[PDB]
């Protein structure tokens, strides 16, 4: 569970947002990129896995899933690739009220930054400090840390 | 402490790396750039702040120190700009064989990787896995989480 991330790509102004939520705290990445590839993708994941210890990655479709690039850089990174199957059907609609709010926060921050990308970190930096009580920040931080000690 | 984190530009293949070390840990986030801006600085420490709570930002140099649009970043982010000299004196050699470790470390993965911003990345997930024993991203999450508590 400490090391469960979730992939997560969702659309705003004509590009794409890709998302990696850290499953048991609610903390995020996120990336504005041109659309999502499979290069993009496996950049993304040598990202988060050299800044958190990333052991399993539910990809966000089918074609991730399959990219040979994504599997190349889980393999480079160690990382578990799986499939993101809602087998718990909960999943589906926590992340679509992850994009509603993302898209909530951004919405409220758009007129700050001249770019996107600016406004998405600004997004980022404000769910991860949201208190909810504990921030999701401080929530991925405890659940690491209570691993190391094990 | 646990929020203090440290500037740091350096350069190769014509390129620039800038890197952010986490102080108390030797932890770092880093990226390549085709210069370093003001605009370029800013944007690194919004994506860093939203991601670790960073308290105070020591500079890499004046300009970054000056510029208007990283004043900009550090009040939006809440994060207390500082100057970076080494009134510790170790400070500049620890930061120069960072610099020097990490170029090795791009070296060793360079062939791995079609452009510098993939190896540079490598080098970071490299650097932050090492067992010194922990890690620095071990030694970070225990830090903070210690100061949470
Ligand atoms: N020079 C001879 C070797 C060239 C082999 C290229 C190759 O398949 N490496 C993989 C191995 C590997 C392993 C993990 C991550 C990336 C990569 C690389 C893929 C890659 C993907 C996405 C990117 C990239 C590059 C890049 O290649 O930099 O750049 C920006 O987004
Ligand atoms: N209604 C539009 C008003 C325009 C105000 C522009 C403005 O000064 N915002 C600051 C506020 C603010 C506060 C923190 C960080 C960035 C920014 C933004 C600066 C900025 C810097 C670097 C970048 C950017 C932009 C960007 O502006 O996106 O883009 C990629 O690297």
């Given at each position: 569970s400490p090391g469960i991330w979730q992939l997560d790509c969702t659309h705003l102004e004509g590009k794409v947002i890709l998302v990696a939520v850290h499953?048991?705290?609610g903390y995020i990445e996120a990336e504005v990129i041109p659309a999502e590839t499979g290069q993009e993708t496996a950049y993304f994941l040598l990202k988060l896995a050299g800044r958190w210890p990333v052991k399993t990655v539910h990809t966000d479709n089918g074609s991730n899933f399959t990219s040979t690039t994504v599997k190349a850089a889980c393999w480079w990174a160690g990382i578990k690739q799986e499939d993101?199957?809602?087998?718990?059907?909960?999943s589906q609609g926590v992340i679509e009220s992850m994009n509603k709010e993302l898209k909530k926060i951004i919405g409220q921050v758009?007129?700050?930054?001249?770019?996107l990308k600016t406004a998405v970190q600004m997004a980022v930096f404000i769910h991860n400090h949201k208190?909810?009580?504990?921030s999701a920040g401080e929530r991925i931080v405890d659940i690491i840390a209570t691993d190391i000690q094990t």
């Open positions: 499953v048991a705290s993101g199957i809602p087998y718990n059907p909960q758009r007129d700050q930054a001249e770019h208190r909810k009580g504990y």
